[PDB]
Design brief:
homodimer, 364 residues, Substrate Binding Domain Of Dnak, Chain:A, Domain 2, 2 domains, 5 helices, identical protein binding (chains A, B), cytoplasm (chains A, B)
């Protein structure tokens, strides 16, 4: 245990100031090193805090899953409740760890930096300034006139040496005491936070390990199998859908054109129902479909289907309108007219007129 | 398992577009929610990484403690080597955890966001644009002139309906397939990262717990007692120093003035050695001290003491110089002169002259 001699302070030898210099070099080296350690440990504390926050947020989000108003379980919902429980338990372990790290690791290393190293620098400056004042006082004293006596000036210059030497002595001794005390504090401040950190880790691993049992392992293995099941169902569904799409592309290719090959797609004149898009008149396109003796209609941005025409005992005929092709008009058993409706081809045109006639004459 | 009917795509009913709208609302809600979960889990991964880094840095700093060139152990040094070992083991646990979190939690949730949700938005746009093109094509077709036949224009306008309806159909079906596939992926992407995270935690707690044994507890209890010992030694040393300082303040108060009470502090004329600061001449203050028949000297910024005068068989006398008080000059047994030296009081002046004379005449 290195120690500065307080007994040597009054004499204030260069050799004494030399010994001081070595305690000051050490104090600077110690400060440099303990600062790097403070910064590393501060990063551990901050990260553990962030971990506690993010883990708790994860759990909370898993709990809110139900409370979200979803358009499209008993198994999923409960599965997520089980995950949210274990994650929230783990979240508590981090929260307990973070607070113990703040108390048992950060507090003592902060105190070393903010109290003890601060005191060294303060005492060092008070001393430097006392030393400077004394140097000045003894210089002025040394220059007193031997030949012309002036009692008052001589007193004042002598008294300034008294006060400055007294101040220098007291400040040097207190600075020596702090530097000597620092030999002990350097050791406490190194070991105490490490011990705090390690005891906290022992508590953390014990606490987390008690929440992580064979029962959890069972639950996890079960979820692993569920995930494999979903993947298998998905992959099978993909296969079914890819085949459905390839079939539909083949079947639909000849039907994309408004006017299909009339030898392959004859006009159906015996339908009892039809549905499809038509233009109506100043012209909007909407979806028409027959239902229970009614022609109903629905636009793309609409919730349900409105009414267009009653088609019990109605008449329907081809119409000429605004130089357009494939127009027709219904007149119900009221004598009242529908909008002028437009089909997309001769066959579509004929199909609508025939279907409406079919429906109109079967209510009997 | 909710599913859109691919069979309904060609007809493209408002009621079909209505069902699509509900799958799209769900996909948006799902994206929103999974994004929040991605962000929370990303914060866990980042924090665990930072923890791994800061813990490893802590250990490394503890190892470098010796390799720092310190002005002022076997116990401390080895104590720090034991801490650095356990902390580096813990550092490895975090490093193992971080990499498994990246692989088993982050990768699958990233893929959901970057592959699967991206595909939904891409397919949705391709479809919207196909739908818009078809709307335009059927509008132009609907406007063909019934009266003036022009085969080429009629062909081109009809063919644009073919191509746009074909494109709309294919794009709608592929978009339906992805949305249907998404019902399965939503479940995988929720459960797979949770399972990855939990299995990683089980490995971590097991791994960390195997490094934290009864033997470590023994080591920690021993360090706790050492710290208590250092505190006790420190507190006792503080008490000793405070008393030394109070004694020195009492003893030194009458000695701070250059000229002490001459009835209480007689001039010592029988010294065989003296040491103290003197001015020398254009005047510098330095520390003089007698050693082995030599007067030696040392400035504040100096490593060792240089030579001023040999004081075997020398003469010394009071001198008048530059109107200064308390000046004297040595002349050795060579006949050569020292600098003009200045003392700080009559008593200091007399004490130096007497001591030098004492030393000069005892070599005999």
């Amino acid at each position: 245990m290195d120690k500065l001699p307080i007994e040597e302070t009054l004499e204030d030898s260069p050799q004494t100031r030399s010994l001081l210099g070595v305690f000051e070099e050490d104090a600077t080296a110690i400060s440099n090193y303990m600062n790097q350690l403070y910064q590393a440990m501060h990063r551990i504390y901050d990260a553990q805090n962030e971990l506690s926050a993010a883990t708790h947020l994860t759990s909370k989000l898993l709990k809110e899953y139900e409370k979200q108003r979803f358009p499209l379980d008993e198994v999923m919902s409960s599965t997520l409740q089980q995950f949210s429980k274990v994650i929230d338990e783990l979240s508590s372990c981090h929260a307990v760890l973070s607070t113990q790290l703040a108390d048992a690791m950060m507090f003592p290393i902060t105190q070393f930096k903010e109290r003890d190293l601060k005191e060294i620098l303060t005492l060092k400056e008070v001393f430097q300034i006392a030393s400077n004042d004394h140097d000045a006082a003894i210089n002025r004293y040394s220059r007193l006139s031997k030949k012309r006596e002036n009692d008052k000036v001589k007193y004042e210059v002598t008294e300034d040496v008294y006060t400055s030497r007294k101040k220098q002595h007291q400040t040097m001794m207190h600075y020596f005491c702090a530097l000597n005390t620092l030999q002990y504090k350097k050791k406490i401040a190194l070991l105490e936070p490490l011990l705090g950190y390690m005891q906290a880790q022992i508590s953390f691993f014990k606490m987390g390990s008690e929440n992580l049992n064979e029962q959890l392992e069972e639950f996890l293995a079960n979820i692993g199998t569920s995930v494999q099941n979903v993947r298998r169902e998905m992959d099978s569904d993909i296969e079914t859908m890819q085949q459905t799409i390839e079939d539909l592309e083949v079947a639909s290719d000849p039907l994309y054109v408004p006017d299909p090959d009339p030898t392959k797609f004859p006009v159906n004149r015996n339908l009892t129902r039809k549905a499809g898009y038509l233009n109506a008149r100043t012209w909007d396109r909407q979806f028409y479909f027959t239902q229970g003796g009614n022609l109903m209609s629905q636009a793309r941005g609409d919730v349900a289907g409105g009414l267009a025409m009653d088609i019990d005992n109605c008449s329907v005929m081809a119409v000429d309108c605004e130089d357009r092709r494939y127009c027709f008009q219904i007149t119900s058993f009221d004598g009242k007219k529908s909008s002028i409706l437009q089909a997309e081809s001769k066959k579509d045109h004929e199909e609508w007129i025939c279907t409406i006639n079919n429906i109109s004459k079967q209510i009997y």
